[PDB]
Amino acid sequence: ENSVAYSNNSIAIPTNFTISVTTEILPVSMTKTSVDCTMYICGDSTECS
């Protein structure tokens, strides 16, 4: 919790600073899969294909 010390006449001004460095990570691709549908489904049979 933090009750902020507000009033009609009070301001908090920072006097020093930190140059924080922070990591944001994003995915940008999957792996480029391709599935050969006839060889997956019917694997090497003409009688299946």
Place this chain on the structure above:
Amino acid sequence: FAMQMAYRFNGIGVTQNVLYENQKLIANQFNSAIGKIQDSLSSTASALG
């Protein structure tokens, strides 16, 4: 809060003197507008579409 709104106004090119030389009016505009939100939401549910 009046020190904050003068910055918010300064952030839209409306120089700070336009806020304080209108403050009670701006308060009444904001209060009246907040009041219309209740009457809108109370009068019709379909706004939550």
